[PDB]
Design a protein around this motif. Structure first.
Motif: not given
Ligand SMILES: [Mg+2]
Ligand SMILES: [Mg+2]
Ligand SMILES: [Mg+2]
Ligand SMILES: [Mg+2]
Ligand SMILES: [Mg+2]
Ligand SMILES: [Mg+2]
Ligand SMILES: [Mg+2]
Ligand SMILES: [Mg+2]
Ligand SMILES: [Mg+2]
Ligand SMILES: [Mg+2]
Ligand SMILES: [Mg+2]
Ligand SMILES: [Mg+2]
Lengths: 137, 100, 97, 122, 86
Positions: B45-66
């Motif tokens: 199953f996937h996970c749902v996380c809120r978009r961070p306010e500090v750098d929310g512009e970088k979070y796009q489709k295909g972006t890899r996060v920790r």
RNA sequence: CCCCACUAUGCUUAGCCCUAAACCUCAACAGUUAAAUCAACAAAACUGCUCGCCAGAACACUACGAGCCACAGCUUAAAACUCAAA
């Protein structure tokens, strides 16, 4: 210093003063808020009566006594007679869960008295006398 | 010489992880709805996380996060139920963006 | 045969069983400072195990110790000892909020 | 067996308190008790007012008496302490060290109760 | 009657804000269960009736705490539809 | 039914009384969760063994007999007439 809701201990030394009088010397305003009537008596630290008032002594009789406004009227009158004898700061010891539990305290505030401490001394037996039977209402 | 399923299960990266609590993983963002980021970290199953306010512009489709995984699947059995209630999603805490 | 088949074992990742703060420690009715940490500072009511966080065994021990201390002149009943009002807070309860 | 006497004495001068402790201990020895140790927890204000022998006590000294006495010696000592006017309160209890605290493994989580009702479609 | 006075159930009024202090005193009595105890002590509750009331409250607490846990558990699903139109 | 006052009584000692929706209306012991799981509802369905108990409603927690520190009592417990339902 940060405010402490706990009262100062009479044995201990505390820097809190109210018009040059320590917490143990403040006159006490005992409130008895019954289901039908409210009795307010103000006494000093040496258990000397200063002022007494109630709904029955302030133009309220029968069911009218068991109201908040009646208790408020008694509170104002109790403050007025206490204020004549030099009472300014009071410690409130409210007994009972009647309708005049808080309104009677309001009369003391609007009458020129200052409230510094609130204490509830409602009699709760720990097992005691068996109360009356339930009402078939 | 055919690799058996038991051999596949033993050497799989998911199996060797052990408990999923407090484990740092790398996920991929595949679907974005408003500020809710849907991140798949290779689990069921996937996970749902809120978009961070500090750098929310970088979070796009295909972006890899920790991610710090807390549970691979969120289930709990309540009063009177004969089976666990499943949310069909994983629980994880978003930390940042993976950079190489 | 195949050496990759799962084997029978107990859980190696099984975390140790949680223990109460008083686990492995004696509770004495004369230890008033410990006892006062589990009663309300305004009423002296004995907190439940949902507040103190103790286990079943220690919750009974504290309750029995408090009751013995109260009748034997070691612990006040209607209130909590003012000298012990500055002890560390271990009960999950908030009054002013 | 081994007992502990939670002894609270009236706040008096040193000669009077010392005489009271010796007199109390002699009562145990006169009843076959073997006194083990005499402890002093100090003197502090009593949590609540205690009335005894038509006297109002607001302060008292705390002492602990550990002794070995037969079972029948416990009843006699309780009657003795009541007649003593210098004893604020005297209680005889088992020594807590005699009881051995069983080792605790920890806390076992309690699973939610299941199969409490039939699985019929209501 | 034999304990020290002005220690138990006593709240100090801060800066003359009596309204806040009284609510604080009321909440403390409610949390410790004193308020509910006094009301049930006005008229004697027979032992048969008390057990029925206690059992109802204990069953009420179990359902209330279980339903509250499920609401918090499913609260994360209260987001918008991620597959609108499907 | 509401309010007030007060007695028996609720307490203690000794001796009685032996009843309850004394009901968790779900017997004791040893088991099983598989088949046909199972009228309904309630608190899922059953196996082995033993004891107690039940055979339409009402008359009937009754009459009579008997036993009991019980004497307006309890235990055991019918019948006739009546109904085609309960
Ligand atoms: Mg008393
Ligand atoms: Mg009487
Ligand atoms: Mg019963
Ligand atoms: Mg039966
Ligand atoms: Mg049997
Ligand atoms: Mg069985
Ligand atoms: Mg069925
Ligand atoms: Mg009968
Ligand atoms: Mg008969
Ligand atoms: Mg016959
Ligand atoms: Mg007869
Ligand atoms: Mg019988």
């Amino acid at each position: 210093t940060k405010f402490s809701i706990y009262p100062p201990i009479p044995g201990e030394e505390s820097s809190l003063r109210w018009a040059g009088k320590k917490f143990e010397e403040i006159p006490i305003a005992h409130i008895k808020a019954s289901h039908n009537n409210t009795q307010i008596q103000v006494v000093s630290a040496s258990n000397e009566p200063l002022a007494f008032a109630s709904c029955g002594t302030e133009g309220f009789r029968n069911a009218k006594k068991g109201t908040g406004i009646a208790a408020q009227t008694a509170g104002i009158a109790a403050a007025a007679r206490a204020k004549q004898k030099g009472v300014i700061h009071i410690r409130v010891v409210v007994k009972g869960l009647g309708p005049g539990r808080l309104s009677a305290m309001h009369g003391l505030i609007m009458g020129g008295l200052e409230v510094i401490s609130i204490t509830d001394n409602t009699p709760i037996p720990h097992x005691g006398c068996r109360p009356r039977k339930a009402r078939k209402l | 010489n055919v690799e058996s399923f038991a051999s596949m299960l033993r050497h799989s990266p998911l199996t060797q992880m052990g408990p999923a609590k407090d484990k740092l993983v790398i996920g991929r963002i595949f679907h974005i709805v408003e500020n809710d980021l849907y991140i798949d970290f290779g689990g069921k199953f996937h996970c749902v996380c809120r978009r961070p306010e500090v750098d929310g512009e970088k979070y796009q489709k295909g972006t890899r996060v920790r991610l710090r995984l807390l549970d691979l699947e969120l289930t709990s059995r309540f009063l009177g139920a004969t089976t666990d209630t499943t949310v069909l999603e994983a629980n994880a805490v978003l930390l940042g963006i993976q950079e190489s | 045969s195949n050496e990759d088949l799962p084997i029978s074992m107990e859980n190696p990742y099984k975390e140790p069983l949680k223990k109460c703060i008083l686990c492995g420690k004696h509770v004495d009715y004369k230890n008033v400072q410990l006892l006062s940490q589990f009663v309300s500072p305004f009423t002296g009511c004995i907190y439940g195990r949902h507040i103190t966080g103790l286990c079943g065994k220690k919750q009974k021990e504290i309750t029995k110790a408090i009751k013995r201390a109260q009748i034997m002149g070691f612990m006040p009943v209607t209130y909590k000892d003012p000298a012990y009002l500055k002890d560390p807070k271990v009960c999950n309860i908030r009054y002013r909020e | 067996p081994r007992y502990e006497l939670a002894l609270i004495l009236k706040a008096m001068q040193r000669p009077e308190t010392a005489a009271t402790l010796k007199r109390t201990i002699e009562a145990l020895m006169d009843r076959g008790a073997i006194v083990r140790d005499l402890e002093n927890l100090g003197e502090r204000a009593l949590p609540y007012r205690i009335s005894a022998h038509s006297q109002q006590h607001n302060r008292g000294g705390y002492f602990l008496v550990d002794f070995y006495a037969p079972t029948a010696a416990v009843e006699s000592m309780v009657e003795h302490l009541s007649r003593d006017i210098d004893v604020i309160r005297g209680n005889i209890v088992k020594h807590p060290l005699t009881q051995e605290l069983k080792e605790c493994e920890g806390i076992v989580p309690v699973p939610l109760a299941e199969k409490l009702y039939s699985t019929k479609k209501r | 009657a034999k304990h020290l006075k002005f220690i138990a159930r006593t709240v100090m009024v801060q800066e003359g804000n009596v309204e806040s202090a009284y609510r604080t005193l009321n909440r403390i009595l409610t949390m410790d269960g004193l308020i509910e105890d006094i009301k049930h002590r006005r008229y004697y509750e027979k032992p048969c009736r008390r057990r029925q009331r206690e059992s109802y409250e204990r069953c009420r607490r179990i359902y209330n705490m279980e339903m509250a846990r499920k609401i918090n558990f499913l609260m994360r699903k209260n987001r918008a539809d991620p597959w609108q139109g499907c």
